[PDB]
Write a protein that binds this DNA or RNA. Structure first.
Ligand code: NI
Length: 58
DNA sequence: AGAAAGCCATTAGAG
DNA sequence: TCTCTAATGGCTTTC
């Protein structure tokens, strides 16, 4: 498969949202997806991984 | 219900 | 070659 590298801007915006909502509703994923020029799935997967990054650091 | 979203462990593509 | 993390597959849980 192929892989896309997320810019400083995209990662920062994602991380910014994560401070407020650890989980996203479907309408908000699509918002961010458009705001960051990412697909819905990428926003879904990102938050999943970041939730995992957050549990270990606790 | 039954898809969609989650959890979680595991790969692998870029730089 | 190494490292970081985007993406994957299996299940189970949500709603
Ligand atoms: Ni069922």
């Amino acid at each position: 498969r192929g892989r896309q590298t997320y810019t400083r801007y995209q990662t920062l915006e994602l991380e910014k949202e994560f401070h407020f909502n650890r989980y996203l509703t479907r309408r908000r994923r699509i918002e961010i997806a458009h705001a960051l020029s990412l697909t819905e799935r990428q926003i879904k997967i990102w938050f999943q991984n970041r939730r995992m990054k957050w549990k270990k650091e606790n």
